[PDB]
Amino acid sequence: PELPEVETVRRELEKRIVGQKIISIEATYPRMVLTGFEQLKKELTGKTIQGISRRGKYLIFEIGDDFRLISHLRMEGKYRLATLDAPREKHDHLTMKFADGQLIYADVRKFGTWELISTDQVLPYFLKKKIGPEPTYEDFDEKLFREKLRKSTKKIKPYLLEQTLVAGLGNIYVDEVLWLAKIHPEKETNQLIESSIHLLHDSIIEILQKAIKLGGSSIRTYSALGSTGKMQNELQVYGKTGEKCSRCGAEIQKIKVAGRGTHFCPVCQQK
DNA sequence: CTCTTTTTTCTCG
DNA sequence: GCGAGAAACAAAGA
Ligand SMILES: Nc1ncnc2[nH]c(S)nc12
Ligand SMILES: [Zn+2]
């Protein structure tokens, strides 16, 4: 998932599991708990979920006053709220069991991670990761964004994907943002003019906030939190290779940029 | 059978 | 410090 999908999961979890006491925690893939599974099971069993927050693409469970469980879903991670008697599915790895149901984490590729850290170590954790600002008008300052772009010779798409200029863009939304802002993904950032940077800054906020409002992109929408998204119906370029651009009518092209599949309109996004 | 395709963090030169 | 490519892993399609 990208930031809008993670935010959708966050909202659903906030509505449903806040106030729930964890009865037990089980793992079939304990290796994904980077801070140690037995240690996490010992610390969190019997504790109450107080809230769910998010930073970039990271989900943060607030459990008791002193613990935070940092979860990253990476490429394919999925949570679901299931009955206590629900059968196990092939790629289910972890479960938090409550008195009236359970929260199951599944991940085909086993890339997702869990890390148990203390409340006062959350802000240093994200400082160490060098995560950039949230994509909001309040936190995403265009003036610093402009200065960072001016100083670099990096290509705009991979630089945006680094999460340092702004947090939360992944392959789908970076392609969508660059098409909306009429910028070629291989454009060197120090070549961008002030007006293009302004459009890019606002397009990042607008696309991500629209995707959040629509419940994220669910191209494969089934039996998991955040699966009822409608943003996939609003995609203009991502996965639209060979289809026509809604603005000019040229065919959308797919290329490889820094190892990622990249979808763009060659007319609207001049090299 | 092989090769390619689908977030983060590393090695290598 | 940099870019390129690989690594973690599983599965589907050409
Ligand atoms: N954390 C990242 N660093 C570099 N490139 C990236 N592409 C995506 S998606 N995430 C990252
Ligand atoms: Zn176009």
Residue numbers in the entry: 1 to 271
How is this structure described in the published paper?
Using this method, we successfully resolved the structures of LRC with the moderately potent inhibitor 2TX (new crystal structure), high-efficiency inhibitors TX13, TX19, TX20, TX27, low-efficiency inhibitor TX15 and, TX19 in the presence of TCEP. A similar non-covalent binding at site II is also observed with TXn. The strictly conserved residues R260 of the ZnF loop and K57 of the β2-β3 loop of the N-terminal LlFpg domain are directly involved in the recognition of 2TX/TXn. The guanidinium group of the R260 side chain interacts with the unique sulfur atom of 2TX, TX15, TX20 and TX27, with the sulfur atom at the C8 position of TX19 (with or without TCEP) or with the N1 atom of the purine moiety of TX13. The epsilon amino group of the K57 side chain interacts with the sulfur atom of all 2TX/TXn compounds. Through binding at site II, the present crystal structures indicate that 2TX/TXn in their reduced forms do not disturb the local structure of the complex (the DNA backbone conformation and the side chain orientation of R260 and K57 are unchanged). Indeed, fine inspection of the crystal structures of C2 with that of the lesion recognition complex C1 resolved in the presence of 2TX, TX13, TX15, TX19, TX20 and TX27 showed that the 5′-overhanging cytosine of the damage-containing strand recognized by the second molecule (Mol-2) of LlFpg in C2 clashes with 2TX/TXn bound at the site II.
Fpg/Nei DNA glycosylases are composed of two globular domains, an N-terminal domain rich in beta-structures and a C-terminal domain rich in alpha-structures. Most of them contain an original zinc finger (ZnF) motif (defining a new class of ZnF) comprising a β-hairpin structure with generally four cysteine residues coordinating the Zn2+ ion (type –C-X2(3)-C(H)-X16-18-C-X2-C-). Only the bacterial Fpg enzymes can excise 8-oxoG, the major oxidation product of purines. To further our understanding of the TXn mode of action, we solved several crystal structures of LlFpg bound to 14-mer [THF:C] (LRC) in the presence of thio-compounds.
